[PDB]
């Protein structure tokens, strides 16, 4: 198919559950006719060859055009083999530098993916119906239960579990033990000041 | 097995530019006729009267053909 790409996946820990990290070099190629239309629409280019040359030269304004056109436009990420329907999911792109795709950690279990060489493919919905199907059916925030058995599929693991387990533990004789606090905010204020464990 | 690959010629590029230009239906037909009669070196091989005859509509004068030809001559490559 057309309007498709692929590359290696890295981890984005800052992302939200509905967001992905898309390289802007990939997005410039994947969204080329949209960029042509947006360039012609605002008078930057009066013909199609002018817009083509502007995109080829990669001027400073085509990046603003790209950030305008990719604003709310889902992309489908797919990892092979697609053993179930959770192997394809829709995300909102965030333009990043580099050549690797950033993936939200919480969706790595559904894809059965790890960050040691895995590659993922990205597809661009074109029509309004396809975009609304991506937003309303295939979006990650819509897929939190397993269709096979009804169990959740956004289970935290590894570093998140280790950190939450470590913070919610008690020691017999720790610094700051036995004092009475007005609330959680005072607890955090004591912790950040080094006055309580 | 062997299948091959499609190649883009001068006429394919010109028709691609015609599709993305705000022509009317009559103007688009005239542009198709004009691009058909363009050789490999980029020159028009027939007079405009032949194009007007090939259009097949009798309410079109030579001025519209001239205007569409002028628009096409500014495509890439220029000339």
């Amino acid at each position: 198919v057309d309007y498709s790409g692929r590359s290696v996946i890295t981890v984005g820990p800052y992302l939200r559950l509905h967001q992905c990290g898309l390289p802007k070099k990939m997005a410039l190629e994947l969204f080329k006719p949209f960029i042509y239309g947006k360039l012609e629409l605002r008078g930057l280019a009066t013909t199609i060859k002018a817009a083509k040359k502007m995109v080829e030269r990669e001027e400073a304004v085509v990046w603003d055009i790209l950030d305008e056109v990719i604003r709310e436009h889902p992309v489908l990420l797919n990892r092979a083999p697609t053993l179930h329907r959770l192997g394809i999911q829709a995300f909102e792109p965030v333009l990043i530098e580099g050549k690797a795709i950033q993936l939200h950690p919480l969706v790595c279990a559904a894809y059965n993916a790890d960050f040691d060489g895995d590659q993922m493919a990205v597809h661009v919905p074109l029509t309004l119906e396809a975009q609304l199907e991506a937003r309303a059916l295939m979006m990650s925030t819509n897929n939190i239960l397993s269709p096979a058995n009804g169990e959740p599929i956004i289970v935290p693991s590894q570093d998140v579990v280790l950190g939450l387990y470590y913070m919610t533990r008690d020691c017999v004789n720790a610094k700051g033990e036995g004092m009475v606090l007005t609330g959680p905010k005072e607890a955090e204020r004591l912790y950040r000041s080094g006055l309580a464990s | 097995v062997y299948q091959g690959e499609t190649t883009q010629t001068l006429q394919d590029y010109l028709m691609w530019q015609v599709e993305l230009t705000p022509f009317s239906d009559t103007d688009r037909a005239i542009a198709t006729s004009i691009v058909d009669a363009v050789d490999e070196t980029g020159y028009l091989t027939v007079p405009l009267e032949d194009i007007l005859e090939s259009i097949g509509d009798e309410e079109i004068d030579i001025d519209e053909v001239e205007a569409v030809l002028k628009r096409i001559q500014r495509f890439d490559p220029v000339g």
């Binding site: 083999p81 053993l83 179930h84 329907r85 897929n143 239960l145 397993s146 269709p147 096979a148 058995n149 009804g150 | -």
Partner: protein, 145 residues
Amino acid sequence: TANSGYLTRRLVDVAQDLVVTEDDCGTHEGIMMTPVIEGGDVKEPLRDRVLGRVTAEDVLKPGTADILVPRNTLLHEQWCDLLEENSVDAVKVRSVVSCDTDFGVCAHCYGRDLARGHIINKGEAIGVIAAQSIGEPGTQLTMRT
């Protein structure tokens, strides 16, 4: 891996054309659900076998003739708790096997979506979902003896 892929391809091919094309077929047939017990251990309790299904007949209390669960009831968590309160050991539910709908199934003989908490909608390709649900865990099984 190849054997799992071949199995799931065959499963998809056999059931690809099954879609929810109705809401109720009016059938009274069903399957009797009892706890799965092997030897001396209860492998599966009754709650997980009747959750999210539709009763094919009225459920009566074990000690009386009083109707406990009426017909055509989607057994959610509250109904399962009520059933376990009165020590119910067998519930007649509706299954896609005993469905009178021609060229597809109805939303009552199927039950819950299992991806959404509500009943299944018309137009859902349940055959593909079933084939992918069966075939996906095939790489967690074994091939060699």
